[PDB]
């Protein structure tokens, strides 16, 4: 089974929460009808390069339904220091500044 990449806008339904593990859980709403599709999601320190940093905790985020405005949860493992949660592609992608230390 080959998924295509979700290409619509996302929005955070709630402000990303920090877990007791030091990870961040996020819930997003997806405006597309091209589900099923794979969610673009990563951490980045450089917004020019968008080089992936940290780890995605969710094993392959997919929107499973064509249903418009469906909601999905994912968990990210941010690196130490400052970074950005980055979700989606294009001019409409959304980011959230994060900071971690331990």
């Amino acid at each position: 089974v080959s998924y295509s990449l979700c290409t619509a806008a996302f929005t955070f339904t709630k402000i990303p929460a920090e877990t007791l593990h030091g990870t961040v859980t996020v819930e997003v709403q997806y405006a597309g009808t091209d589900g099923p599709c794979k969610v673009p999601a990563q951490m980045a320190v450089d917004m020019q390069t968008l080089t992936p940093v940290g780890r995605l905790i969710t094993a392959n985020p997919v929107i499973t339904e064509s249903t418009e405005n469906s909601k999905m949860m994912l968990e990210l493992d941010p690196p130490f220091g400052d970074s950005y949660i980055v979700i989606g592609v294009g001019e409409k992608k959304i980011t959230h500044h994060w900071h971690r230390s331990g």
Partner: antibody
Amino acid sequence: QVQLQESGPGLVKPSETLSLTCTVSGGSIDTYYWSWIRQTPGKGLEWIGCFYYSVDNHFNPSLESRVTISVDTSKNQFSLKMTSMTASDTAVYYCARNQPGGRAFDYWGPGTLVTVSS
Amino acid sequence: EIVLTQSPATLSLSPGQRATLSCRASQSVSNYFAWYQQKPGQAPRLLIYDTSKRATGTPARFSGSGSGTDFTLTISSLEPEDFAVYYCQERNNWPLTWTFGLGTKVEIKR
């Protein structure tokens, strides 16, 4: 908003390779899915394949073994290559943009006609 | 994959009449079908998408409806310039593939 323009050879010899190029303005082809579609006056509209730049390709299963894509984000152009052309492959060929976040194609080039003949 | 069947093949109506075009799918995928208008010598143009939404520049007399396996394009009051072939279209998920019907040709009586 987005405009696309096909360019191709017009005529292809039987069993030779077709090459087509799409020039896009109003949008960078390094984002979103872009497709090649074709239409024979004979058997309707047929999707050939698509790419999302630096992510993946997807191809019509019946045509996949004959088809190759290329992308030049500096010229905002992408290409179709289809080997072993026969008279069945005579058709109008289009490039098109996959609707961001949708199931349709929202912008189309005007189409270029390809005749397979010796 | 999925087969889209359109009917009638041809439609001949006077301007001002209401045109109703059918698209039936062999099995259901999503509730979000598209329709294209093709005029002679031109590429298809996206008319309706997600079953009921109008593409940019689609006049209000065009509307779409349907769900599951049955979808309909409605031209509430036909105009001479609506002469064209109309295609319905859907995206298969597995295997990923984009599929069109063979079209309905709308001719204008006068």
